[PDB]
Hints:
The structure is cut from a larger assembly and holds chains A, B, C, D, E and F.
Chain A: H1 8-19, E1 25-31, E2 37-42, E3 47-51, H2 57-73
Antiparallel strand pairs in A: 1-2, 2-3
Chain B: H1 21-34, H2 40-60, H3 67-83, H4 101-105, H5 109-116, H6 122-130, E1 134-136, E2 156-158, H7 171-184
Antiparallel strand pairs in B: 1-2
Chain E: H1 5-18, E1 24-32, E2 36-42, E3 47-52, H2 57-71
Antiparallel strand pairs in E: 1-2, 2-3
Helix pairs in contact in E: 1-2
The complex binds magnesium ion (20 copies).
Chain C binds three RNA strands through β2, α1 and β4.
Amino acid sequence: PQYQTWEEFSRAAEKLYLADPMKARVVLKYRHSDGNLCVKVTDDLVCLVYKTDQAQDVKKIEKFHSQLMRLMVA
Amino acid sequence: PVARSWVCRKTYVTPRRPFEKSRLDQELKLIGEYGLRNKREVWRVKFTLAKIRKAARELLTLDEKDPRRLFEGNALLRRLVRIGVLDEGKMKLDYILGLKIEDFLERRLQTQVFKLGLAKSIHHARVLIRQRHIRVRKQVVNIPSFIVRLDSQKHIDFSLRSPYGGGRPGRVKRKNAKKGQGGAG
Amino acid sequence: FPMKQGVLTHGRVRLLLSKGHSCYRPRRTGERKRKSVRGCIVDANLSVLNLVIVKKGEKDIPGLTDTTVPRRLGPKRASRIRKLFNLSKEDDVRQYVVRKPLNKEGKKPRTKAPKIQR
Amino acid sequence: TVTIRTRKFMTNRLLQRKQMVIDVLHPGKATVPKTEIREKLAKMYKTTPDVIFVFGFRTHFGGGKTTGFGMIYDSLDYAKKNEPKHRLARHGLYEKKKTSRKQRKERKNRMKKVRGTAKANVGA
Amino acid sequence: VLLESEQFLTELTRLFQKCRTSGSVYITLKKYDGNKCLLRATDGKKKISTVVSSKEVNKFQMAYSNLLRANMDGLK
Amino acid sequence: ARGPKKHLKRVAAPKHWMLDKLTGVFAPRPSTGPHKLRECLPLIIFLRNRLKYALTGDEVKKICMQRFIKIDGKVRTDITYPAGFMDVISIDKTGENFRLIYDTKGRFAVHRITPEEAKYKLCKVRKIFVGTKGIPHLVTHDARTIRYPDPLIKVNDTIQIDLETGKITDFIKFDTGNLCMVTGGANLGRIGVITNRERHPGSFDVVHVKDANGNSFATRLSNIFVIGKGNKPWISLPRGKGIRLTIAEERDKRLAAKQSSG
RNA sequence: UGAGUCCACUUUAAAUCCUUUAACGAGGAUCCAUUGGAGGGCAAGUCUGGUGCCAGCAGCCGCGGUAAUUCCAGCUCCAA
RNA sequence: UCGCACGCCCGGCGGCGACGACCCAUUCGAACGUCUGCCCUAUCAACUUUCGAUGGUAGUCGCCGUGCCUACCAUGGUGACCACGGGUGACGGGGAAUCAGGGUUCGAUUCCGGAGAGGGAGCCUGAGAAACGGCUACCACAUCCAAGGAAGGCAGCAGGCG
RNA sequence: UACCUGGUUGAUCCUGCCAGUAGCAUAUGCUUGUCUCAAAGAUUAAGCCAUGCAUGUCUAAGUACGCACGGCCGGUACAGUGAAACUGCGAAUGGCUCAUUAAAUCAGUUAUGGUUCCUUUGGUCGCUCGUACUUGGAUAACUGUGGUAAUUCUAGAGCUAA
Ligand SMILES: [Mg+2]
Ligand SMILES: [Mg+2]
Ligand SMILES: [Mg+2]
Ligand SMILES: [Mg+2]
Ligand SMILES: [Mg+2]
Ligand SMILES: [Mg+2]
Ligand SMILES: [Mg+2]
Ligand SMILES: [Mg+2]
Ligand SMILES: [Mg+2]
Ligand SMILES: [Mg+2]
Ligand SMILES: [Mg+2]
Ligand SMILES: [Mg+2]
Ligand SMILES: [Mg+2]
Ligand SMILES: [Mg+2]
Ligand SMILES: [Mg+2]
Ligand SMILES: [Mg+2]
Ligand SMILES: [Mg+2]
Ligand SMILES: [Mg+2]
Ligand SMILES: [Mg+2]
Ligand SMILES: [Mg+2]
């Protein structure tokens, strides 16, 4: 469920997207008062979440988001 | 660096004065006589006539018994004979200047179909050309601007895939026959 | 940063390195590139010291001298085989070439011999 | 009612084949398929249709004539010796791999980064 | 609120500039047919939405990436 | 440019190759060899564009790598080998020997010869060099360095070499009355007898050559190749026989023959 | 009869388009061709209603100050 | 040096090739040169010159000829036939448009040659580079960082900001 | 196609310019049914670039002891494919742009008798007069220890070929 650290959530979310691209969506929760970031991918069967900020993760999260958008379009 | 031609040329040149009444009179008489579509159809034949007359003037500016002049004159007379505007006994490079837009428009396949009489009207002949009912030397001609050669003049007839010739009837005839058989039973 | 023979410092020195020098592999043919190394004089500014035991002492260390590790490959040049087996110039090398046994699960046991050069 | 004539007949002993320009007359129907072309050339030249390869049809206007090029090999071994793999795969004796070209370029640039034996371990 | 692709980015920048003190930023990306992707943003009070088509993803994703890299900062 | 050129554009190709404009951007750049860039004709153009034996350059590569093409007594495996003037291409399986002689126009001609004629060829020498021990050397147009020649062979002469041994059999000295193949320029393809030689110090010399039909013409000696003594050639000649009759006479010989054939 | 729809060849490295080809497919054949102008240069309304030197038109001359052949709308016509 | 067919003598002689190179030619070229030709400007009339300007002599260096450079001498060289200086919203040409005959305007643009990879400068390798999808230093712009350090050049194909 | 017209005046004849008139480009507005070709970040910014790709390559004929596969005729080395690596060649070609440049580039014409030149081809390659049945030791790929936050960073120890 809570695949933290790194690459576990990425492999699990790529598996969720390659299961079905239609019903799957991704949500992104940004917080500045507490200052943390949250990614959650769901495919209306299970929901997989990722809750850390760690400064450097912003670039790889937006690259994963732009990869998901390119896979939705192409 | 790509492999293509980039070679093209305007076949028509617009006149210098746009609203000459006598010029519009002459062009309107030409279109109403020979069944044309626009003024560009007049202007492109006028510009090909301008090409031929410019070549003729360039030959007459040359000296007699010049080899380039004789070769180009004989080739241009051969072209005029094979398009059938100038006669085979009349062929001389001085008679090219006395040639006319009416005699150029007489060799249109629309006009030749109208003169052979297989079509009723000139525009009805153009309808037949558009609807692909006639052929020239076992080849369907879809475009009325086909310059018919004198050797290929006698081969104008109806095409094989044509209801007016020896072929299957058209869509309206099939629909009326199907409606009649459906009404009969 | 690795060390370098013959720079005679103890700090950090940036040097031009080409083909035929230490701590640099040329990618293009004859490529020169600045690389940063440390002086050869041993001081406290070091993480690792590389040590090569030349003379063996009285005691026996269980880590290094106890575990005997054999050669990985055998002699391939015929002159080197002659120098190893004390051979003459007329005797055979084909009989005395060193061949390696190969054995693992699934596959058959084999014995692979090197191509003798020269 | 389909008629096949041959023009520009040439015998390439240096390619071990025959070649000609094929002229197909088919009134009252569409363009006939290459399988029927190979069958009619086979029953014309008294050979097996496996060696006859025909490609490149162009249909004239009006709809009664096509022009195509075709070669007639001596054997299937000679055909596989000098015949392009794409026209072999048109009929199905050869099957090219399905590795996409951009992913092959990406695999090559990933093998360029890692030096050593692990170039094979980078791929999958 | 269904807006233009550029107006969506400007209002999304205004959402972060309003949430520089307190408030969440919700970004929802999903497939859209009625190739298109639905991208929606919500602060909790004002919702904005857009549909990105295939004709504008190269124009959209790069500025959206620079917007995210400029607007998101967590802990060191 | 920072070095030598390896590509050749299709537009930048010379006119006598007759390569078409629409099919390709690049032309087959010939490799270095016994002939110049704009004087030779490549093997891929001779095999694919003229003989029409192959369709594509891959097929030309297959033909040259099955070891079939035999250029002047040796197998060349390159598709861009420079095959120039008086080159003999032998194909064994078809049994065809070809001698690259120019046509009456600027182009080369597909010229069928016998094996008795393909055994030898003729080459114009360019200079005589004295080697390191006083040894005379001929430098031919196809870069053949033949040593110990006949000392009557001079700078502007031709030699009849043998393909099997690479030695001279006979020679033609550049004299008046001999035949003349014109190898280059506006008179490329003419065949006639030499009627005048005009020397020039500094500026290049010129030769007036008279046609058999009386059409005399001047040509510089750099594009001149004698092919025999008097009016008797030692090779076989293509149709047309090197006259370059007028365009009106060409139109007549086309049109009258066409109307007679029907 | 196409334009479209669309099985099937052909095309092509694999496709697309062209050509071929079945079956559909047109009477306001609504399956509706617009772009500028109508005082002169410059082809083509002293037609009708409103505005009254205001709005505006006009590349030049000029039109509009309550009967505008020049504006704004309808009809008609002219140029391509 | 390496690979294929595998023979004949009284251990030794043998073929077809591929590869490695002093030197001479040939080809691909490269570069200095000979003559002729380029838009506007005089509110640019004199310009260059012991910091090479124009030549001679003798050398260095260059792949070679040369003030290319060095040492000593001569005071020379260009210009009203427009030098020198400046501007170009000027890469040059084959060519494009308009055209009676004459001209005018454009040419960045698929072919040939020149220059370049943000601005200059230097160099290894290599026949061929002062190469930037090669390096070495400085300036402008910019990435990661543990604050010791490392790495960049789309006037290439797509595409993005301005 | 070697072409005119309106406008100074109460009216006329001249000079004169303005306005039309007709093409080739550059952008824009309206509209658009078919089809063959077809320009396309040049003009202002030769301004800046996230991302992916664009130059790598093995034949019977330069090196094969990575079982990574694989054949049995082995004991007289190497049956046969082949990762990686050493070596040779290419990367100085092609593509993009016109910033700089006005006897400069470039175009016609010339010579290198004033020079080089990988490759290809043709010559030469027992011409010399003084262990060869084949000479030496390093090194990469292989095994094993790591350093850095991090590089297409690399080292120490064993090996082993041209
Ligand atoms: Mg009106
Ligand atoms: Mg008017
Ligand atoms: Mg009027
Ligand atoms: Mg008006
Ligand atoms: Mg300037
Ligand atoms: Mg230009
Ligand atoms: Mg510019
Ligand atoms: Mg450069
Ligand atoms: Mg550079
Ligand atoms: Mg480059
Ligand atoms: Mg680049
Ligand atoms: Mg007055
Ligand atoms: Mg008046
Ligand atoms: Mg005007
Ligand atoms: Mg159609
Ligand atoms: Mg269509
Ligand atoms: Mg720009
Ligand atoms: Mg730039
Ligand atoms: Mg280039
Ligand atoms: Mg400029």
